[PDB]
Amino acid sequence: MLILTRRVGETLMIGDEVTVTVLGVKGNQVRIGVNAPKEVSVHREEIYQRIQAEKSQQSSY
Amino acid sequence: MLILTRRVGETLMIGDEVTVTVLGVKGNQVRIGVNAPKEVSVHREEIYQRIQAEKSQQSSY
Numbered sequence: 855m856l857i858l859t860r861r862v863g864e865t866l867m868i869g870d871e872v873t874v875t876v877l878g879v880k881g882n883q884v885r886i887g888v889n890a891p892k893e894v895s896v897h898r899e900e901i902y903q904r905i906q907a908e909k910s911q912q913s914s915y
Numbered sequence: 916m917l918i919l920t921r922r923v924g925e926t927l928m929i930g931d932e933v934t935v936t937v938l939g940v941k942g943n944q945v946r947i948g949v950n951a952p953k954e955v956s957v958h959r960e961e962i963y964q965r966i967q968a969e970k971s972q973q974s975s976y
Contacts, residue, residue: 856967858960860947868957869930876937878945886921886937894955896929899919906917 869894930955 858864861878868874873889890896892907904910919925922939929935934950951957953968965971 855948855950856959856964857946857948858963858967859941859944861945864947864960866935866949866957866959868933868935868951868955870956872929874927874929874935876945876947878939878947883920884922884937884939884945885918886925886939887916887918888927889916890929894929895931896927898917898927899925902919903917906919 869896930957 860876864874864876864878866874869890871891871893875887875889877885877887888898898907900912904912921937925935925937925939927935930951932952932954936948936950938946938948949959959968962971966974
């Protein structure tokens with residue numbers, strides 16, 4: 855558990871070739887950017903990757 | 916590259932047993948929480964983990 859303040863442009867790399875920047879700065883909603891490859895076991899919100907990663911993939915398709 | 920708005924309590928898992936919540940909500944500075952194990956190749960800001968992960972030296976509180 856590591857809690858580090860952020861609001862500009864972070865850059866962490868967990869796995870073996872990733873890159874996740876937690877922008878932090880934004881109007882009302884903060885646009886968080888998560889850059890990660892589909893090689894390592896990566897799980898996220900269905901809708902999230904459903905609109906960014908894969909255009910409507912769902913469980914089985 | 917996946918850009919998803921966030922400001923409440925996210926939860927992504929990249930690797931094989933992690934958990935990073937990009938709080939988003941906060942006063943002036945946004946306290947971002949990155950929960951990740953020291954098993955997979957994870958690299959971050961020296962100072963960051965130096966104060967959270969491994970006690971680089973010491974702190975006054």
